[PDB]
Enzyme design. Structure first.
Site, PDB file in Angstrom:
ATOM      1  N   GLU A   1      -2.584  60.995 -55.565  1.00  6.62           N
ATOM      2  CA  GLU A   1      -1.711  61.682 -54.619  1.00  6.62           C
ATOM      3  C   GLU A   1      -1.510  63.133 -55.018  1.00  6.62           C
ATOM      4  OE1 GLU A   1       1.733  59.023 -53.147  1.00  6.62           O
ATOM      5  OE2 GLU A   1       1.297  58.275 -55.190  1.00  6.62           O
TER       6      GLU A   1
ATOM      7  N   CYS B   1       1.114  50.824 -48.020  1.00  3.13           N
ATOM      8  CA  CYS B   1       1.530  51.038 -49.402  1.00  3.13           C
ATOM      9  C   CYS B   1       0.704  50.179 -50.357  1.00  3.13           C
ATOM     10  CB  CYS B   1       3.030  50.750 -49.580  1.00  3.13           C
ATOM     11  SG  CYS B   1       3.575  50.966 -51.277  1.00  3.13           S
TER      12      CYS B   1
ATOM     13  N   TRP C   1       6.861  55.664 -58.262  1.00  2.00           N
ATOM     14  CA  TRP C   1       6.150  56.547 -59.176  1.00  2.00           C
ATOM     15  C   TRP C   1       4.784  56.861 -58.574  1.00  2.00           C
ATOM     16  CZ3 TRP C   1       8.026  51.767 -60.937  1.00  2.00           C
ATOM     17  CH2 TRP C   1       7.102  50.707 -60.907  1.00  2.00           C
TER      18      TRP C   1
ATOM     19  N   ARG D   1       2.839  47.773 -53.461  1.00  2.00           N
ATOM     20  CA  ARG D   1       3.796  46.725 -53.117  1.00  2.00           C
ATOM     21  C   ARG D   1       3.861  45.579 -54.120  1.00  2.00           C
ATOM     22  NH1 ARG D   1       1.887  45.164 -47.286  1.00  2.00           N
ATOM     23  NH2 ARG D   1       0.007  46.389 -47.853  1.00  2.00           N
TER      24      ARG D   1
HETATM   25  C1  HEM Z   1       6.526  51.904 -57.102  1.00  3.93           C
HETATM   26  C2  HEM Z   1       5.392  52.610 -57.039  1.00  3.93           C
HETATM   27  C3  HEM Z   1       4.733  53.002 -55.689  1.00  3.93           C
HETATM   28  C4  HEM Z   1       3.470  53.401 -55.583  1.00  3.93           C
HETATM   29  C5  HEM Z   1       2.447  53.519 -56.734  1.00  3.93           C
HETATM   30  C6  HEM Z   1       3.203  53.690 -54.196  1.00  3.93           C
HETATM   31  C7  HEM Z   1       1.994  54.124 -53.708  1.00  3.93           C
HETATM   32  C8  HEM Z   1       1.819  54.570 -52.423  1.00  3.93           C
HETATM   33  C9  HEM Z   1       0.763  55.429 -51.948  1.00  3.93           C
HETATM   34  C10 HEM Z   1      -0.375  56.036 -52.798  1.00  3.93           C
HETATM   35  C11 HEM Z   1       0.943  55.604 -50.643  1.00  3.93           C
HETATM   36  C12 HEM Z   1       0.060  56.486 -49.742  1.00  3.93           C
HETATM   37  C13 HEM Z   1       0.803  57.822 -49.812  1.00  3.93           C
HETATM   38  C14 HEM Z   1       0.121  58.950 -49.091  1.00  3.93           C
HETATM   39  O1  HEM Z   1      -1.130  59.039 -49.141  1.00  3.93           O
HETATM   40  O2  HEM Z   1       0.865  59.776 -48.493  1.00  3.93           O
HETATM   41  C15 HEM Z   1       2.134  54.879 -50.236  1.00  3.93           C
HETATM   42  C16 HEM Z   1       2.661  54.790 -48.965  1.00  3.93           C
HETATM   43  C17 HEM Z   1       3.857  54.184 -48.626  1.00  3.93           C
HETATM   44  N1  HEM Z   1       4.772  53.612 -49.500  1.00  3.93           N
HETATM   45 FE1  HEM Z   1       4.403  53.185 -51.432  1.00  3.93          FE
HETATM   46  N2  HEM Z   1       4.355  53.443 -53.458  1.00  3.93           N
HETATM   47  C18 HEM Z   1       5.322  53.037 -54.360  1.00  3.93           C
HETATM   48  C19 HEM Z   1       6.637  52.746 -54.033  1.00  3.93           C
HETATM   49  C20 HEM Z   1       7.133  52.605 -52.762  1.00  3.93           C
HETATM   50  C21 HEM Z   1       8.497  52.245 -52.428  1.00  3.93           C
HETATM   51  C22 HEM Z   1       9.591  52.033 -53.505  1.00  3.93           C
HETATM   52  C23 HEM Z   1       8.589  52.183 -51.084  1.00  3.93           C
HETATM   53  C24 HEM Z   1       9.786  51.822 -50.176  1.00  3.93           C
HETATM   54  C25 HEM Z   1      10.849  51.125 -50.650  1.00  3.93           C
HETATM   55  C26 HEM Z   1       7.279  52.489 -50.538  1.00  3.93           C
HETATM   56  C27 HEM Z   1       6.951  52.518 -49.210  1.00  3.93           C
HETATM   57  C28 HEM Z   1       5.820  53.135 -48.731  1.00  3.93           C
HETATM   58  C29 HEM Z   1       5.548  53.426 -47.350  1.00  3.93           C
HETATM   59  C30 HEM Z   1       6.444  53.060 -46.161  1.00  3.93           C
HETATM   60  C31 HEM Z   1       4.370  54.048 -47.282  1.00  3.93           C
HETATM   61  C32 HEM Z   1       3.683  54.551 -45.988  1.00  3.93           C
HETATM   62  C33 HEM Z   1       4.060  56.030 -45.925  1.00  3.93           C
HETATM   63  C34 HEM Z   1       3.571  56.726 -44.678  1.00  3.93           C
HETATM   64  O3  HEM Z   1       3.015  56.049 -43.755  1.00  3.93           O
HETATM   65  O4  HEM Z   1       3.743  57.982 -44.627  1.00  3.93           O
HETATM   66  N3  HEM Z   1       6.421  52.741 -51.588  1.00  3.93           N
HETATM   67  N4  HEM Z   1       2.633  54.256 -51.352  1.00  3.93           N
HETATM   68  C1  XVO Z   2       0.409  64.521 -46.534  1.00  4.95           C
HETATM   69  N1  XVO Z   2       0.465  63.730 -47.772  1.00  4.95           N
HETATM   70  C2  XVO Z   2      -0.675  64.057 -48.644  1.00  4.95           C
HETATM   71  C3  XVO Z   2       1.719  64.036 -48.468  1.00  4.95           C
HETATM   72  C4  XVO Z   2       2.791  63.043 -48.035  1.00  4.95           C
HETATM   73  C5  XVO Z   2       3.649  62.790 -49.249  1.00  4.95           C
HETATM   74  C6  XVO Z   2       4.196  63.884 -49.911  1.00  4.95           C
HETATM   75  C7  XVO Z   2       4.978  63.691 -51.039  1.00  4.95           C
HETATM   76  F1  XVO Z   2       5.527  64.739 -51.683  1.00  4.95           F
HETATM   77  C8  XVO Z   2       5.199  62.409 -51.502  1.00  4.95           C
HETATM   78  F2  XVO Z   2       5.957  62.232 -52.599  1.00  4.95           F
HETATM   79  C9  XVO Z   2       4.652  61.310 -50.853  1.00  4.95           C
HETATM   80  C10 XVO Z   2       4.969  59.956 -51.455  1.00  4.95           C
HETATM   81  C11 XVO Z   2       4.466  58.669 -50.796  1.00  4.95           C
HETATM   82  C12 XVO Z   2       4.859  57.747 -51.931  1.00  4.95           C
HETATM   83  C13 XVO Z   2       6.054  57.037 -51.926  1.00  4.95           C
HETATM   84  C14 XVO Z   2       6.396  56.256 -53.028  1.00  4.95           C
HETATM   85  C15 XVO Z   2       5.537  56.211 -54.127  1.00  4.95           C
HETATM   86  C16 XVO Z   2       4.367  56.958 -54.099  1.00  4.95           C
HETATM   87  N2  XVO Z   2       3.505  56.949 -55.149  1.00  4.95           N
HETATM   88  N3  XVO Z   2       4.075  57.709 -53.018  1.00  4.95           N
HETATM   89  C17 XVO Z   2       3.868  61.492 -49.716  1.00  4.95           C
END
Ligand code: HEM
Ligand code: XVO
Ligand code: HEM
Ligand code: XVO
Ligand code: H4B
Ligand code: H4B
Ligand code: ZN
Lengths: 417, 411
Positions: A292, A115, A287, A118
């Site tokens: 993404e 993430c 958000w 964070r």
């Molecule tokens: C607040 C603004 C946040 C932003 C801008 C953000 C941004 C991102 C992005 C860009 C990714 C990669 C997503 C992808 O390519 O699928 C990600 C992954 C992740 N985020 Fe954040 N996130 C946010 C909030 C959170 C919150 C609130 C949580 C949990 C409480 C969280 C937990 C995670 C986790 C666990 C992943 C790994 C997801 C996976 O392995 O599929 N994020 N985040």
């Molecule tokens: C395969 N992958 C491209 C799609 C996986 C996927 C599909 C979604 F609709 C989606 F909301 C998120 C969000 C991951 C995330 C969580 C919190 C904040 C943020 N900014 N992002 C991730």
């Protein structure tokens, strides 16, 4: 393992020293002879922790919690240890206090190595839904979450936590992978309408009784499973689903593409592990980072895949790849997405601001916590990689607990009643 | 155990068995991944014979004569030589096989579909820096080939005691100088300020321009290095212009056509070749994204976005991303217009996916470093972004080595 590990930033020469890796608890998948850093999921859901397995996991978490509040070794600490130990003995499990649940959820986010967002981890609103018993109650909790987190466009990060796993036959699950996603429909001629990534889940919903409008941007219903029962369908009230029409600050024709996207990214299929307890339904939301939507959702070949159409309206030379027509259209699509969210006052962050914030967060964590686990493959954005600061930042990846984990899709394991 | 790698765009699954043959470490453990670390942290007779035997075995395995009379006799010949000299010498065929396989095993190289098409120049008879200069000039001329670039490597004598190393002090054969300015800024390539200063200290007269080709600094047999000017007719350069922006040429940008790495170490069968310059042809993003737009290199995004009249007040306008794409269009257009070999990152990554398919079929795997294989721009619209890769270390191999100015005892 060595006591200190150093990471270098090759743009700034800053060197940081990691000691937090000494607390890593779970495997990465790598070995001394192979690196699995680019594997997406490196290695039964109803074999639950035994009493003997649970004791040390609970103590480790309780110890970490009392250390965080500067009460390590205190009377309250030893009493909580004794209380937890008795609960595991007589009931094979235990219940977190509200303070511990909140601490655990914030730190699972703090520990999420993939993430980039964070820097915000301590500002998470935690909704305790452990009193929930039915799919209707889960629906109520999720709607309240969506409304709180959306906040009319001033998005607020949040998590709602349903009851933990017991024997593995009474799991709470959100079958949706995200709370808000668009349907995808496979056509007899092989083409796809809507979002091709959601074709399988859309088919499940239809089989469960959903009547599909069969459009390009149909919000999927929630499919909610309480206490291991069969899941049940609910429509999210459309006024709770904030959406943004996509337009471009320069190209008047961009609106004629008819694109839009929802404002709230809310992951609903992950498992939250705190102190050896397993919360199999724990939807959380933040958000968006613009890429993404702009790069993955719109421009992945197996997604909406709009590069060709945008390139045509841009009148680009699409005959040879060396014109970089794909790269050129990709930038314009991401310009439009950021412009459209900002114009409608819906919180969004561009990939330059987010990665700059992550480096500051990472540096602060190294100073105050002794490290920050980070997955470079996921942290670097999917466009313009090297012009962001994280490209040049060496990162160490390791698994700390509390943590978010993947879990199997529930349609693959559910025993239909 | 067999390991599976999946492409998440095409759903293709490949099965890796080749990783079983590796014995060198990656830097990771079961508990910590070091996949984004750029460099995770003299041989005796005793260490040398198992390494030689392992390499002779895979060579004769490759030519389908494992266990042959030739194989058995070569093992004995090598054993005797390590006994009486503490080292051994590779046969010509072994040297060629080893250099090609060091390339084939380079997990960070997206260009490896070409690996078996490598011209190998044996320079192990060299004794002086003047000889090194001759060999390097012949390499540059051969590899450049009037713009129809040809992959090549030139291999100088192997390390003996560590006191008589052959080294090319340049990090690449052709590079531009960098000068620290009185007012603090940097003229030319900031990455080369230190090396430029060493050449000045050794007597090089700098023209003090923005694109001065550096001299060669050549160290033979552990002696002090000596300076040589590559003859200019051998140094092919491309003025960068843009197919639509006529002002782009007025930026005065150029680059050289020949990417030629000269500071790595080639390990074959336990032997260490500390001087082994090798060269291919450019992928456009090496120049257009890294060399021109890294904040610590030529750093030209602000200038270009200015001439494009972009709103630069806020990052979310993506002005940097816009200028970056236009810069990389110009580089590809310019090399192509001058008929100098270049590959774009779309074509290069597509070729690498095909290369991976080939290697999994015929070899059982292909070590690959996702962090390096994915291009520095437009990552997820290239197919490697969606390709799981296993990274592991096979020998023969290319390795990094310390900069010579941190080790050399000056006489
Ligand atoms: C607040 C603004 C946040 C932003 C801008 C953000 C941004 C991102 C992005 C860009 C990714 C990669 C997503 C992808 O390519 O699928 C990600 C992954 C992740 N985020 Fe954040 N996130 C946010 C909030 C959170 C919150 C609130 C949580 C949990 C409480 C969280 C937990 C995670 C986790 C666990 C992943 C790994 C997801 C996976 O392995 O599929 N994020 N985040
Ligand atoms: C395969 N992958 C491209 C799609 C996986 C996927 C599909 C979604 F609709 C989606 F909301 C998120 C969000 C991951 C995330 C969580 C919190 C904040 C943020 N900014 N992002 C991730
Ligand atoms: C023929 C065309 C070639 C292309 C298009 C190509 C492309 C690339 C690129 C883009 C990189 C990343 C380097 C960086 O980002 O700085 C790389 C790495 C590398 N290349 Fe190739 N390459 C080619 C030929 C060769 C040859 C002939 C050799 C040696 C015989 C070679 C050996 C390597 C090695 C060892 C690396 C990794 C260097 C490291 O670990 O830092 N390449 N290649
Ligand atoms: C991180 N940086 C200091 C290392 C730079 C570097 C180190 C190496 F050993 C290396 F082989 C290459 C390859 C560059 C290259 C070689 C051949 C063809 C091509 N098109 N490109 C680049
Ligand atoms: C194969 C590779 O691991 C896969 O494509 C990863 C790469 N990096 C990623 N990074 C992010 N943020 N999200 C992703 O889905 C992926 N996919
Ligand atoms: C820290 C990180 O490993 C470093 O910036 C890497 C990232 N990926 C790279 N990839 C390539 N091809 N070349 C590089 O120099 C780098 N640098
Ligand atoms: Zn690893």
């Amino acid at each position: 393992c060595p006591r200190f590990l150093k990471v270098k930033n090759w743009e700034t020469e800053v060197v940081l020293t990691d000691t937090l890796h000494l607390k890593s608890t779970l495997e990465t998948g790598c070995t001394e002879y192979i690196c699995m850093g680019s594997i997406m999921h490196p290695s039964r859901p109803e074999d639950v922790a035994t009493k003997d397995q649970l004791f040390p996991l609970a103590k480790e978490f309780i110890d970490q919690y009392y250390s965080s509040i500067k009460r390590f070794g205190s009377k309250a600490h030893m009493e909580r240890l004794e209380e937890v130990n008795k609960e595991i003995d007589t009931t094979s499990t235990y219940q977190l206090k509200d303070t511990e649940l909140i601490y655990g959820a914030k730190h699972a986010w703090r520990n999420a190595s993939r993430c980039v967002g964070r820097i915000q981890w301590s500002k998470l609103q935690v909704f305790d839904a452990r009193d929930c018993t039915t799919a209707h109650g889960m629906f109520n909790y999720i709607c309240n979450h969506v409304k709180y987190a959306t906040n009319k466009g001033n998005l607020r990060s949040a998590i709602t936590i349903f009851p933990q796993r017991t024997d593995g036959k009474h799991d709470f699950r959100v079958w949706n992978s995200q709370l808000i996603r668009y349907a995808g429909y496979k056509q007899p001629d092989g083409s796809t309408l809507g979002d091709p990534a959601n074709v399988q889940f859309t088919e499940i919903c239809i089989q469960q009784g959903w009547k599909p409008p069969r459009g390009r941007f149909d919000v999927l219903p929630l499919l909610l499973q309480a206490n291991g029962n069969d899941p049940e369908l609910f429509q999210i009230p459309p006024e709770l689903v904030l959406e943004v029409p996509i337009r471009h600050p320069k190209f008047e024709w961009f609106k004629d593409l008819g694109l839009k996207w929802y404002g709230l990214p809310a992951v609903s299929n992950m498992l939250l592990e705190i102190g050896g307890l397993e919360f199999s339904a724990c939807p959380f939301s933040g958000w968006y980072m613009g890429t993404e939507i702009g790069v993955r959702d719109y421009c992945d070949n197996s997604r909406y895949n709009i590069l060709e159409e945008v390139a045509k309206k841009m009148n680009l030379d699409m005959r040879k790849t060396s014109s970089l027509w794909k790269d050129q259209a990709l930038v314009e699509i991401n310009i439009a997405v950021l412009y459209s969210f900002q114009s409608d006052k819906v919180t969004i962050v561009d990939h330059h601001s987010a990665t700059e914030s992550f480096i500051k967060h990472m540096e602060n964590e190294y100073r105050c916590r002794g490290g920050c686990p980070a997955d470079w493959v996921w942290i670097v954005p999917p466009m313009s990689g090297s012009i962001t600061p994280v490209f040049h930042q060496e990162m160490l990846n390791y698994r700390l607990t509390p943590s978010f984990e993947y879990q199997p899709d529930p349609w693959n394991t559910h025993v239909w009643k």
